Scaffold this active site. Structure first.
Site, mmCIF file in Angstrom:
data_model
loop_
_atom_site.group_PDB
_atom_site.id
_atom_site.type_symbol
_atom_site.label_atom_id
_atom_site.label_comp_id
_atom_site.label_asym_id
_atom_site.label_seq_id
_atom_site.Cartn_x
_atom_site.Cartn_y
_atom_site.Cartn_z
ATOM 1 N N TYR A 98 -7.189 -1.087 -9.298
ATOM 2 C CA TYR A 98 -8.307 -0.811 -8.406
ATOM 3 C C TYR A 98 -9.629 -1.370 -8.949
ATOM 4 O O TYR A 98 -10.674 -1.280 -8.289
ATOM 5 C CB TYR A 98 -8.405 0.689 -8.115
ATOM 6 C CG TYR A 98 -7.225 1.245 -7.338
ATOM 7 C CD1 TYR A 98 -6.822 0.672 -6.126
ATOM 8 C CD2 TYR A 98 -6.507 2.342 -7.820
ATOM 9 C CE1 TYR A 98 -5.734 1.171 -5.432
ATOM 10 C CE2 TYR A 98 -5.418 2.851 -7.126
ATOM 11 C CZ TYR A 98 -5.040 2.262 -5.940
ATOM 12 O OH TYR A 98 -3.972 2.770 -5.266
ATOM 13 N N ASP A 160 1.773 8.403 -12.816
ATOM 14 C CA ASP A 160 2.862 7.698 -13.495
ATOM 15 C C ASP A 160 2.685 7.618 -15.012
ATOM 16 O O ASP A 160 3.658 7.490 -15.748
ATOM 17 C CB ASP A 160 2.983 6.281 -12.953
ATOM 18 C CG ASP A 160 3.887 6.194 -11.755
ATOM 19 O OD1 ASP A 160 4.612 7.167 -11.439
ATOM 20 O OD2 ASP A 160 3.929 5.167 -11.064
ATOM 21 N N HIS A 412 -1.541 -5.869 -11.985
ATOM 22 C CA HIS A 412 -1.221 -5.226 -10.731
ATOM 23 C C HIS A 412 -2.447 -4.944 -9.879
ATOM 24 O O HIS A 412 -3.581 -4.902 -10.370
ATOM 25 C CB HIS A 412 -0.352 -3.981 -10.938
ATOM 26 C CG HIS A 412 -0.996 -2.906 -11.752
ATOM 27 N ND1 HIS A 412 -2.230 -3.047 -12.337
ATOM 28 C CD2 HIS A 412 -0.574 -1.661 -12.068
ATOM 29 C CE1 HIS A 412 -2.541 -1.938 -12.978
ATOM 30 N NE2 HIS A 412 -1.551 -1.079 -12.832
ATOM 31 N N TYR A 493 -5.766 4.423 1.736
ATOM 32 C CA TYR A 493 -6.316 5.700 1.244
ATOM 33 C C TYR A 493 -7.289 5.547 0.048
ATOM 34 O O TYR A 493 -8.003 6.494 -0.330
ATOM 35 C CB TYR A 493 -5.169 6.691 0.917
ATOM 36 C CG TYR A 493 -4.845 6.837 -0.569
ATOM 37 C CD1 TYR A 493 -4.172 5.831 -1.259
ATOM 38 C CD2 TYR A 493 -5.231 7.985 -1.290
ATOM 39 C CE1 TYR A 493 -3.889 5.945 -2.620
ATOM 40 C CE2 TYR A 493 -4.941 8.114 -2.660
ATOM 41 C CZ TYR A 493 -4.270 7.083 -3.316
ATOM 42 O OH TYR A 493 -3.981 7.166 -4.665
ATOM 43 N N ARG A 494 -7.310 4.348 -0.522
ATOM 44 C CA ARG A 494 -8.015 4.033 -1.754
ATOM 45 C C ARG A 494 -8.000 2.502 -1.887
ATOM 46 O O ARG A 494 -7.104 1.833 -1.347
ATOM 47 C CB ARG A 494 -7.340 4.746 -2.939
ATOM 48 C CG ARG A 494 -7.408 4.051 -4.283
ATOM 49 C CD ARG A 494 -7.885 4.919 -5.435
ATOM 50 N NE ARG A 494 -6.809 5.723 -6.019
ATOM 51 C CZ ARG A 494 -6.733 6.085 -7.292
ATOM 52 N NH1 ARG A 494 -7.652 5.726 -8.183
ATOM 53 N NH2 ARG A 494 -5.717 6.812 -7.685
HETATM 54 C C1 LIG Z 1 -1.421 0.295 -13.432
HETATM 55 C C2 LIG Z 1 -0.905 1.590 -12.860
HETATM 56 C C3 LIG Z 1 -1.807 2.422 -12.189
HETATM 57 C C4 LIG Z 1 -1.407 3.595 -11.534
HETATM 58 C C5 LIG Z 1 -0.053 3.928 -11.563
HETATM 59 C C6 LIG Z 1 0.864 3.110 -12.227
HETATM 60 C C7 LIG Z 1 0.454 1.940 -12.879
HETATM 61 C C8 LIG Z 1 1.445 1.233 -13.761
HETATM 62 N N1 LIG Z 1 0.386 5.081 -10.959
HETATM 63 C C9 LIG Z 1 -0.526 5.952 -10.412
HETATM 64 C C10 LIG Z 1 -0.095 7.171 -9.891
HETATM 65 O O1 LIG Z 1 1.087 7.488 -9.926
HETATM 66 N N2 LIG Z 1 -1.019 8.033 -9.327
HETATM 67 C C11 LIG Z 1 -2.362 7.684 -9.280
HETATM 68 O O2 LIG Z 1 -3.178 8.447 -8.783
HETATM 69 N N3 LIG Z 1 -2.786 6.475 -9.793
HETATM 70 C C12 LIG Z 1 -1.861 5.562 -10.257
HETATM 71 N N4 LIG Z 1 -2.318 4.422 -10.872
HETATM 72 C C13 LIG Z 1 -3.778 4.077 -10.732
HETATM 73 C C14 LIG Z 1 -4.636 4.472 -11.943
HETATM 74 O O3 LIG Z 1 -4.209 3.807 -13.108
HETATM 75 C C15 LIG Z 1 -4.665 5.977 -12.183
HETATM 76 O O4 LIG Z 1 -4.981 6.557 -10.944
HETATM 77 C C16 LIG Z 1 -5.677 6.423 -13.242
HETATM 78 O O5 LIG Z 1 -5.479 7.788 -13.562
HETATM 79 C C17 LIG Z 1 -7.126 6.227 -12.798
HETATM 80 O O6 LIG Z 1 -7.914 5.857 -13.902
HETATM 81 P P1 LIG Z 1 -8.986 6.851 -14.585
HETATM 82 O O7 LIG Z 1 -8.515 8.247 -14.517
HETATM 83 O O8 LIG Z 1 -9.203 6.396 -16.043
HETATM 84 O O9 LIG Z 1 -10.315 6.757 -13.664
HETATM 85 P P2 LIG Z 1 -11.632 5.924 -14.036
HETATM 86 O O10 LIG Z 1 -11.210 4.729 -14.750
HETATM 87 O O11 LIG Z 1 -12.657 6.777 -14.787
HETATM 88 O O12 LIG Z 1 -12.262 5.373 -12.674
HETATM 89 C C18 LIG Z 1 -11.965 5.990 -11.445
HETATM 90 C C19 LIG Z 1 -13.128 5.923 -10.452
HETATM 91 O O13 LIG Z 1 -13.635 7.232 -10.316
HETATM 92 C C20 LIG Z 1 -15.045 7.287 -10.362
HETATM 93 N N5 LIG Z 1 -15.447 8.266 -11.398
HETATM 94 C C21 LIG Z 1 -14.729 8.594 -12.527
HETATM 95 N N6 LIG Z 1 -15.413 9.532 -13.211
HETATM 96 C C22 LIG Z 1 -16.548 9.812 -12.540
HETATM 97 C C23 LIG Z 1 -17.578 10.697 -12.806
HETATM 98 N N7 LIG Z 1 -17.307 11.747 -13.569
HETATM 99 N N8 LIG Z 1 -18.633 10.783 -11.923
HETATM 100 C C24 LIG Z 1 -18.656 9.999 -10.789
HETATM 101 N N9 LIG Z 1 -17.618 9.118 -10.532
HETATM 102 C C25 LIG Z 1 -16.580 9.033 -11.394
HETATM 103 C C26 LIG Z 1 -15.540 5.878 -10.618
HETATM 104 O O14 LIG Z 1 -16.265 5.478 -9.483
HETATM 105 C C27 LIG Z 1 -14.301 5.012 -10.790
HETATM 106 O O15 LIG Z 1 -14.334 3.922 -9.892
#
Ligand SMILES: *Cc1cc2c(cc1C)nc1c(=O)[nH]c(=O)nc-1n2C[C@H](O)[C@H](O)[C@H](O)COP(=O)(O)OP(=O)(O)OC[C@H]1O[C@@H](n2cnc3c(N)ncnc32)[C@H](O)[C@@H]1O
Ligand SMILES: *Cc1cc2c(cc1C)nc1c(=O)[nH]c(=O)nc-1n2C[C@H](O)[C@H](O)[C@H](O)COP(=O)(O)OP(=O)(O)OC[C@H]1O[C@@H](n2cnc3c(N)ncnc32)[C@H](O)[C@@H]1O
Ligand SMILES: C/C=C/c1ccc(O)c(OC)c1
Ligand SMILES: C/C=C/c1ccc(O)c(OC)c1
Lengths: 550, 550
Positions: A98, A160, A412, A493-494
């Site tokens: 994403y 995952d 991916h 959805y995303r």
């Molecule tokens: C590569 C991959 C990804 C994946 C997956 C399997 C593979 C091999 N399977 C998933 C699954 O089963 N379910 C799911 O929901 N996601 C899946 N993914 C996608 C992804 O890797 C995961 O979702 C992962 O957990 C998300 O990454 P993370 O948790 O580290 O989130 P982030 O990097 O911080 O960024 C997410 C977005 O959220 C907003 N954000 C995050 N924190 C804040 C705060 N506190 N305040 C305001 N906004 C926030 C950001 O905008 C960011 O874009």
């Protein structure tokens, strides 16, 4: 630090310097990296899109700041207002597929909320919940539960993989695989720093914990919550919680997530479905079974290339340059002992109850000839089931990282429409998606994750991030599935960073009344448009639509 | 018409008189009433609060208006933005105990959305939902299912009476007693008219249905919804839906609500608890049974007088003018074979499952001394078990209306704190509440309803609406309790008109931050403040707080 690779819009170099000087004064130079490298999953990049579909430095940070605590966040934000400096808030930044940790607007300060804001804040047993800061991964929390003998009373809910932020994922409205698989739904009592700098807690988070000597003179950030905060989401009045998921409305610093009590009985399983067209009747069977609580969780229906890619890269199955034929997938099916589709579920509770459910499920999938039922013990030891046995009882694993390598320098990118829980419709989505994939010359790879009345269809686009012909063909692929799926009444959805605009442009019922009303709420809470400008297609008025939209 | 008892703020007789002739031209005079009477439940008033604690004419409308269709609403909204006119949008106005139809600000037009906007737009079997205009009561929708033998496929979820609006209730975050009792969380896709007058559909309802000849040239209002519109609430982007529950951010014209498929087996039950004290150990037992899923619905825990009040008024138990003694309730309990607290629930699904659960519950509750278990069959014709056995299976009913008539000119007012699911908390709260009712000289009446991790505590204030000495004491009671419960860390989930400002001031964490942010969003979307100013304590800038708060 001196001179950066991309400045934010309308900002002089002089300011960027008198800015990062002011940030360094607050957070210490240890917590500031100025950019003047793709990395890995375990050490995630905070600068750019590691599974890049556009040029590598297209979505690129100017700085990265790691606030030490809630107050540094207020201090940073104060400054961002003073300088009109966009901020991109991350928690862990493992949002690959994403965009990862890249800012939608190049030049932004990436906010590494998770580096230092780390604490598992509370784990409450009788109310069966936890409070979390941005820096707690799924694994962090798991180890918290083990090293406290807590795995015997409460369970997690994992995507995952285990490296993702608990709160980060939740504000993305992401999805996991137990009865508590709807991660956003399981929240209660968020803490948020607003664009204007003020701290807000939501729901019964707004009801103060009554005064006592122990809690006097504590900074608001550090104050305890009143009993019901993390037990009842709604509080009183308008229910603003959801304005903070897939939004630029706030920076979330604390969230409550409900944890599922140990069910006192567990059993995962696999149902293999021989033919490609058995998806149709499978979904049709899962439908009354979901709506009637025989399936208790979020089961997944995997494509055979999903399991194939976990086990071995493409080069080991076929040497071909084009996508794989229909005969050659039956060959990988008969090979691994899997079907074309594979349905992974789990039962929760005391044996008496698991007994009845399982007979009902078995006896329902029996109308599909050549079907086969496996408990984890029945399968090989490298099996995907043997990994999802852990996943659907809240145990973090990393094996599923292996499918990203289905092509040389693997990356991916998710195309994630939502489909009906009807077999007819799911085939339609498949055939529409399967078609364009073969046109772009990509293999088709995906799961359906079974929600109550909805199915998240995760179309897993893997591509060689160093093949410039192919990156461009994925872009063309993505932009087309979006439009195609809309022409058939399916929205995503995303969204990835570069498709935020287009996907939002998709929900244009009644001349984009949703985005208009959204924009209106943005400009009111973020006057100078500094929190995550561009996220979900929502642009504040100082960012021209013409200049910024993709 | 020409001369109302009350004009809105700042609005001349001539201005009102133009607005009124104008509105008449759009909707017809047989849909407009100017006011220059308390009604019943079977025919609710639209002018004022029928279970009034304040003066009878305290919350009063200048006129009622009933739009025929959505375009009418837009038209009206535009007149209101022209003339600076407060609207007060109702569906049915059966909000008895919370103000009824009465407008928070007097002089408001009450918008009776339910009188003409009336239709069950949809009932989809595979999707197991429906789509509902503001006027579809519970009974109405119940009757719609019977006329298509769908009763055998789909079940309702219902509050204690059958009259409520399906979406009226839903947006008040109302509560019923099957697995589907959290009414708000069972919506997907809602339609709103904003304060500006523009038509919004939420969630997937913003992805438009693709084009085909049969739907060409339909006004927005009349357009079909895309296939995932009532299956998946989230849509894409920031999730605004909750912005329209218990708020003044728009007029809801349609909603989706999930319907539970016939479970294939249903048993209800009554466990009685002998001692007033038993409340404590009872709730501790609930906790794991709720949290582990032995208890599938929202079961309730009922105080003896509630049941008693269903069976006859106070004068049928004692000629006593003051509260019934503690020992007298013991007399009453045995009089009709109940306990001092009574637990009602139901079991869903096939025989094998119900059995196992209904043992798990027998065993658990048996720790309480003197416990006693009754199925519907085991109790007298008039039974509350008999009434409820219908209620927890989605059948509309009206029997529970009687308890409103505990006192000569009986009117009810609700005090609605949330409690943890812990016997010790429950008891603390109960004690705080019983005490105060006593000082007010009233019989304490009340139910806990069981949420997963919280308990809705409906203290049911019934009083004699012509007693002014009583009206004033209930006013003293309410305002004392609100504060009392805040001092013990407990907020009220829903509010009456006269207590909205006070309840909100209770949610003042970090210097009232929750209210302020709420006011911003409001003023943004309602430049002229014409939508329901002052609901939930949320006032637009033109309404001065000094002039307008209680
Ligand atoms: C590569 C991959 C990804 C994946 C997956 C399997 C593979 C091999 N399977 C998933 C699954 O089963 N379910 C799911 O929901 N996601 C899946 N993914 C996608 C992804 O890797 C995961 O979702 C992962 O957990 C998300 O990454 P993370 O948790 O580290 O989130 P982030 O990097 O911080 O960024 C997410 C977005 O959220 C907003 N954000 C995050 N924190 C804040 C705060 N506190 N305040 C305001 N906004 C926030 C950001 O905008 C960011 O874009
Ligand atoms: C007297 C009584 C009340 C009661 C109850 C038992 C008795 C004997 N048991 C209840 C229960 O079990 N659960 C519950 O949630 N409420 C219970 N009550 C209270 C009441 O009777 C019912 O809740 C009833 O359903 C509420 O009345 P109704 O459904 O008719 O709602 P309304 O009066 O029309 O409006 C209520 C508020 O909703 C907002 N509203 C309504 N329509 C709109 C539209 N279309 N757009 C925007 N907002 C809307 C307004 O704020 C309105 O005041
Ligand atoms: C593979 C699993 C997966 C990937 C990306 C997502 O967004 C998701 O959510 C349902 C699931
Ligand atoms: C008695 C029933 C009741 C009355 C008013 C309410 O608001 C409610 O919701 C939980 C339930």
């Amino acid at each position: 630090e001196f001179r950066p690779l991309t400045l934010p819009p309308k900002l002089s170099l002089s300011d960027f310097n008198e800015f990062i000087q002011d940030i360094i004064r607050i957070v210490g130079s240890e917590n500031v990296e100025v950019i003047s490298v793709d990395g890995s999953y375990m050490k995630p990049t905070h600068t750019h899109d590691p599974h890049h579909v556009m040029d590598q430095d297209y979505f690129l940070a100017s700085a990265i700041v790691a606030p030490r605590n809630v107050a540094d966040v207020q201090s940073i934000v104060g400054l961002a207002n003073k300088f009109s400096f966009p901020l991109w808030p991350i928690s862990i930044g493992r949002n690959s597929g994403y965009g990862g940790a890249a800012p939608r607007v190049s030049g932004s300060v990436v906010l590494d909320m998770g580096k230092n804001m780390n604490r598992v804040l509370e784990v409450n047993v009788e109310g069966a919940y936890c409070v979390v800061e941005p820096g707690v991964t799924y694994h962090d929390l798991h180890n918290y539960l083990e090293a406290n003998n807590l795995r015997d009373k409460l369970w997690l809910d994992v995507p995952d993989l285990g490296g993702g932020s608990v709160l980060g994922n939740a504000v993305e409205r992401g999805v996991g695989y137990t009865p508590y698989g709807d991660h956003w739904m399981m929240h209660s009592g968020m803490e948020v720093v607003l664009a204007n700098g003020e701290l807000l807690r939501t729901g019964m988070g707004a009801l103060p914990d009554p005064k006592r000597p122990e809690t006097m003179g504590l900074k608001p950030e550090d104050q305890p919550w009143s009993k019901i905060a993390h037990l009842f989401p709604y509080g009183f009045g308008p229910y603003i919680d959801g304005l903070f998921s897939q939004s630029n409305m706030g920076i979330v610093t604390k969230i409550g997530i409900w944890l599922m009590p140990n069910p006192r009985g567990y059993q995962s399983y696999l149902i293999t479905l021989p033919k490609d067209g058995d998806l149709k009747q499978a979904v049709d069977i899962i439908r009354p079974l979901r709506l009637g609580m025989a399936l208790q969780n979020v089961p997944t229906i995997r494509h055979i290339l999903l399991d194939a890619a976990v086990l071995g890269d493409k080069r080991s199955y076929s040497s071909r340059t084009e996508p794989l034929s229909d005969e050659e997938l039956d060959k990988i099916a008969k090979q691994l002992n899997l079907g074309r589709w594979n349905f992974y579920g789990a039962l929760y509770g005391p044996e008496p109850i698991r007994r009845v459910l399982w007979e009902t499920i078995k006896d329902a999938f029996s109308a599909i000839p050549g079907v086969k039922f496996y408990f984890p013990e029945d399968t090989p030891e490298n099996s995907v089931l043997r990994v999802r046995d852990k996943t659907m009882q809240g145990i973090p694993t990393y094996d599923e990282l292996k499918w990203i390598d289905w092509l040389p320098n693997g990356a991916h990118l998710f195309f994630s429409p939502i489909a009906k829980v009807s077999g007819e419709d799911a085939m339609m989505q498949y055939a529409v998606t399967k078609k364009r994939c073969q046109e772009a010359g990509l293999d088709f790879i995906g799961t359906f994750t079974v929600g109550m009345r909805e199915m998240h269809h995760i179309v897993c686009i893997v591509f060689n991030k160093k093949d410039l012909i192919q990156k461009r063909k994925v872009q063309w692929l993505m932009r087309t599935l979006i439009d195609d799926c809309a022409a058939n009444g399916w929205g995503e959805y995303r969204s990835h960073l570069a498709f935020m605009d287009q996907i939002m442009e998709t929900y244009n019922w009644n001349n984009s009344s949703f985005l208009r009303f959204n924009e209106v709420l943005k400009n009111a809470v973020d006057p100078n448009g500094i929190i995550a400008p561009g996220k979900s297609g929502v642009w504040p008025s100082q960012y021209s639509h013409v200049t910024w939209k993709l």
